[PDB]
Design a protein around this ligand. Structure first.
Ligand SMILES: N#Cc1cc2c(Oc3ccccc3OCCn3ccc(=O)[nH]c3=O)cccn2c1
Lengths: 544, 424
């Protein structure tokens, strides 16, 4: 396991030095069982003995898994070493993997120990094996190779591997090698006999650099279990998902449920987490038992009905197009599928609005399209064609009068219900020959009282008393009254930029029941106009 | 020639910024480009011991079919500010907005021959990302003075001042400003001879070793505008307009009164009293109501006070410039640049070609570039924008239409209210 590999120069943090930490503990037999392994690591040249001539120190403990293992507590080193380039924050997603006729998995052994460490560094990594009392001088060792648990080991091993592989993929650039941590994944289109030749060649190449590889053929035979996935030579899916059935549900359980569901939603379509996470809305207690709702139980039941049958996805083929289609589940939840061929889904997903209390369907569709765009760029490096349940004249009307600047790429119509619509439109200009309601509302901050009402141009007046409301809610309530007591054409005038701003956004749904009612009223009307005048300027207003 | 020593502000580390995922197209561009760039000794491949990173994007040069590498050096600029502002900082002349023609050139190809300080080379590290996280990106750091860094023109400033001297001697009515990779040349001349004078300057820089890719359509342009040419004499705070009507109605007067009451924040001398009493009785919106003598008095008064410049509006070099763009629809966008609220240092409106050419995001992007350019011309730096766009959307499509060498700071507002036609 020796290596002639160029080493990465390492420094500690500025104005810092190596760790000095004392270790007494513990047993006679831990001390005894450490020496045996230490000798072998020394013989293999992975470590070397030293007298001080200061080594510094690091705490060292021994653990048992028949075969003992050496554990070093490096927390007092890692804090003192320089920061490194982060390695991989995430893993390759199977949806974007090139399909090859054969795939081989090769794991290297003693990975970090198979790469050398910087010479002017090693002195900081040294430690001691305590003699059995008797104030007897300790056994001081230091690391000549990348230590386990050290801050720079993953990055440096990964780098050394990256450089080592370079004069190979040059010789045979028909073979594709994915690098992940200690693992190397190979795949190709060659003959099954030629592929097995290339793997065997690469193994020897790595062997000359001091990298071990599985001897029996090459280890794991498909399907593979990797990072919670299942990789078949044709199709891919997730690992078995078990949703527990219990009477008591804590926050700890709901976190796992939401986790597993969110996870399983990448392939299994139709999974809805909205109601189940509503229980997780209490963010406070971790161990508190949370009672389920009637909507959440049903949601989980639906998810179970989806998780009965197995379903799986396909792989990526650049020579073919990329298509994505979106469906609305109605609660603010959306599901989407990304495919090449109609019956073969690469992967599925879900998008649900959280932030904000007021949103319409077109905007949510835009945000869904957005998430799909980002995800698509990340995974396949391109953007999909879009199949969306919306008429062009609907969308075109939406983004023209919308204050934000939105965008959607090339997309073709889909008539699959439910379609996204504009259920109503407020009139741009006032209606001539229509009753004009002057609405206002008010509340007391302390008593949470206050009233909502209107005075028309025809002299009609009304006031409804309201208990347990807020200053804003009454400002919505008045505009509600104006919608109830009017004809099919009504001009409303309100002083509240709150309510005005809300209604002008044209929401088709909300959390507040009052707003739901107002939407209901707005759909039934023929023509609706809403104007705005400054409050407390004494113009046409109400004083209550 | 060796190197000018570059130190960050004491108590600050180097830039660590995540790299945005990119299209395979853009990745191929940033691979090819950085490959030949590595072959020219301008950049080198680094190791795992270099934790620093800076974003990188692929844009179009101007109208060109060939790609261009655009580094977002912002976070490095914030941490190098002692170098390019305090110590080596480049002064901004306050008379550039005075001239009637200002042509902008790209001199950024000059910095590529100047070596960067060895100890500081690790900070300029950038990563060319891969697809689906196959591998971590291709790592590179800058051996030469990088484009987009504010320290590059600060260092090159001496050589630049030496080169421009024989030109400034021959015509000392011309003021020249250098902002990073861009050379803003002001003049009072006729358009016809201004463009020629500009060509004189271009060939002057060209014969002294600065090769500027301002070479235009050569002789005959197919359909396009030759130069990038502004006219700051028309840049000033624009007045507020009260819509003129033959006959006024109730609701029209309501919108009027509301608008004026909004204008009462920038103009304490506004009185709506005579317009408030005329709406006293509760009438229909569509009822046609004529104005009185007092009301017309109050209209003619506030029409006069509205076209006067706001008293006591002064630029503060300590404070940042802040820009707001709001969407007016039909390819028109209105914008205001202020430091403190309701004190508007500059206001205006930007519009585009009517037909199927441009869309929302494109219009907004170009608008940002324009406003930024005007701000550079006037106060000598870029405003932080409050953008009327979804964050993740802008973070996606902004590079497509971005032809500028710099990248001003920005943030995204989800609110903006009834202020629509108030600025129209
Ligand atoms: N244990 C495991 C494991 C294998 C892999 C992996 O294998 C590939 C390597 C090169 C090219 C295509 C590949 O796979 C594409 C998908 N695939 C996977 C398995 C198979 O038999 N056939 C197939 O086409 C890539 C990423 C993560 N991995 C994890």
């Amino acid at each position: 396991p020796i290596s002639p590999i160029e080493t990465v120069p390492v420094k500690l943090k500025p104005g810092m030095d190596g760790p000095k930490v004392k270790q007494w503990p513990l047993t006679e037999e831990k001390i005894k069982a450490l020496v045996e392994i230490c000798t072998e690591m020394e013989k293999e040249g992975k470590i070397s003995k030293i007298g001080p001539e200061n080594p510094y120190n690091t705490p060292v403990f021994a653990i048992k898994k028949t075969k003992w293992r050496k554990l070093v507590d490096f927390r007092e080193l890692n804090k003192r070493t320089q920061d490194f380039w982060e390695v991989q924050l995430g893993i390759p997603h199977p949806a974007g993997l090139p399909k090859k006729k054969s795939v081989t998995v090769l794991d290297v052994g003693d990975a970090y120990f198979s790469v050398p460490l910087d010479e002017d560094f090693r002195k900081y990594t040294a430690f001691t094996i305590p003699s059995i009392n008797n104030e007897t001088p300790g056994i001081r060792y230091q690391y000549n190779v990348l230590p386990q648990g050290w801050k720079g080991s993953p990055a440096i091993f990964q780098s050394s591997m990256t450089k080592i592989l370079e004069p190979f993929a040059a010789q045979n650039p028909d073979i594709v090698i994915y690098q992940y941590m200690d693992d190397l994944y190979v795949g190709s289109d060659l003959e099954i006999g030629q592929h097995r030749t290339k793997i065997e060649e690469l193994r020897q190449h790595l062997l000359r650099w001091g990298l071990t590889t599985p001897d029996k053929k090459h280890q794991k035979e498909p399907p593979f279990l990797w990072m919670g996935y299942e990789l078949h030579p044709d199709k891919w899916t997730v690992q078995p998902i078990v949703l527990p059935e219990k009477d008591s549900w804590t926050v700890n359980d709901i976190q796992k449920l939401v986790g597993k569901l969110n996870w399983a939603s990448q392939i299994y379509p139709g999974i809805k987490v909205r109601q189940l996470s509503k229980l997780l809305r209490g963010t406070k207690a971790l161990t508190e038992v949370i009672p389920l709702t009637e909507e959440a139980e049903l949601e989980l039941a639906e998810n179970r009905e989806i998780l009965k049958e197995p379903v799986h996805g396909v792989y990526y083929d650049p020579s073919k197009d990329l298509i994505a289609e979106i469906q609305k589940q109605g609660q603010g939840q959306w599901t989407y599928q990304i495919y090449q061929e109609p019956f073969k889904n690469l992967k599925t997903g879900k998008y649900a609005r959280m932030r904000g209390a007021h949103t319409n369907d077109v905007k949510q569709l835009t945000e869904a399209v957005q998430k799909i765009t980002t995800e698509s760029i990340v995974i396949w490096g391109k953007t999909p064609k879009f199949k969306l349940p919306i008429q062009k004249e609907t969308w075109e009307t939406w983004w023209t009068e919308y204050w934000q600047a939105t965008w959607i790429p090339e997309w073709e119509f889909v008539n699959t219900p439910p379609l996204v619509k504009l259920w109503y439109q407020l009139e741009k200009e006032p209606i001539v020959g229509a009753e004009t309601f002057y609405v206002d509302g008010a509340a007391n901050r302390e008593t949470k009282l206050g009233k909502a009402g209107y005075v028309t141009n025809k002299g009609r007046q009304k006031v409804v008393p309201l208990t347990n409301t807020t200053n804003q809610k009454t400002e919505l309530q008045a505009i509600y009254l104006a919608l109830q007591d009017s004809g099919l054409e009504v001009n409303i005038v309100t002083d509240s930029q709150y309510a005005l701003g809300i209604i002008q956004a044209q929401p088709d749904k909300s959390e507040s029941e009052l707003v739901n009612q107002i939407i209901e009223q707005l759909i039934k009307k023929e023509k609706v106009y809403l104007a705005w005048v400054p409050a407390h300027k004494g113009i046409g207003g109400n004083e209550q | 020639i060796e190197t000018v020593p570059v130190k960050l502000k004491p108590g600050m580390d180097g830039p660590k910024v995540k790299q945005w995922p990119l299209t395979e197209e853009k990745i191929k561009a940033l691979v090819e480009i950085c490959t030949e760039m590595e072959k020219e000794g301008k950049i080198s491949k680094i190791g795992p011991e270099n934790p620093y990173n800076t974003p990188v994007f692929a844009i179009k040069k101007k109208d060109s079919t060939k790609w261009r590498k655009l580094v977002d050096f912002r976070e490095l600029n914030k941490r190098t500010q002692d170098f390019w502002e305090v110590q080596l900082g480049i002064p901004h002349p306050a008379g550039l907005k005075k001239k009637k023609s200002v042509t902008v050139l790209d001199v950024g190809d000059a910095y590529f021959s100047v070596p960067l300080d060895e100890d500081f080379r690790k900070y300029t590290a950038f990563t060319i990302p891969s697809i689906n996280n196959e591998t971590p990106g291709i790592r590179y750091q800058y051996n030469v003075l990088p484009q987009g860094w504010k320290g590059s023109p600060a260092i090159f400033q001496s050589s630049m001042t030496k080169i421009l001297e024989p030109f400034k001697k021959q015509n000392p009515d011309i003021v020249i400003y250098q902002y990073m990779d861009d050379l803003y040349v002001g003049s009072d001349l006729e358009i016809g001879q201004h463009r020629t004078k500009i060509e004189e300057l271009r060939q002057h820089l060209l014969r002294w070793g600065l090769t500027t890719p301002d070479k235009k359509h050569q002789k005959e342009p197919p359909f396009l505008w030759m130069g990038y040419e502004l006219h700051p004499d028309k840049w000033t705070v624009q007045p507020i307009v009260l819509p003129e009507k033959d006959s006024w109605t109730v609701n029209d007067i309501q919108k009027l009164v509301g608008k004026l009451n909004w204008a009462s924040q920038i103009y304490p001398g506004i009185k709506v009293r005579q317009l408030s009493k005329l709406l006293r009785g509760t009438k229909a919106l569509t009822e046609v109501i004529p104005l009185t003598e007092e009301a017309e008095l109050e209209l003619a008064e506030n029409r006069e006070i509205l076209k006067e410049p706001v008293h006591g509006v002064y630029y503060d070099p300590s404070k940042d410039l802040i820009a707001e763009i709001q969407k007016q629809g039909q390819g028109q966008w209105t914008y205001q640049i202020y430091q403190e609220p309701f004190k508007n240092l500059k206001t205006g409106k930007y519009a585009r070609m009517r037909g199927a050419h441009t869309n929302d995001v494109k219009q907004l992007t170009e608008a940002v570039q324009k406003i930024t350019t005007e701000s550079i011309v006037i106060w000598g730096k870029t405003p932080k924008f409050k953008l009327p766009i979804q964050k993740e959307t802008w973070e996606t499509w902004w590079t497509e239409y971005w032809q500028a060498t710099w990248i001003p700071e920005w943030e995204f507002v989800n609110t903006p209210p009834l202020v629509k036609l108030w600025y129209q």
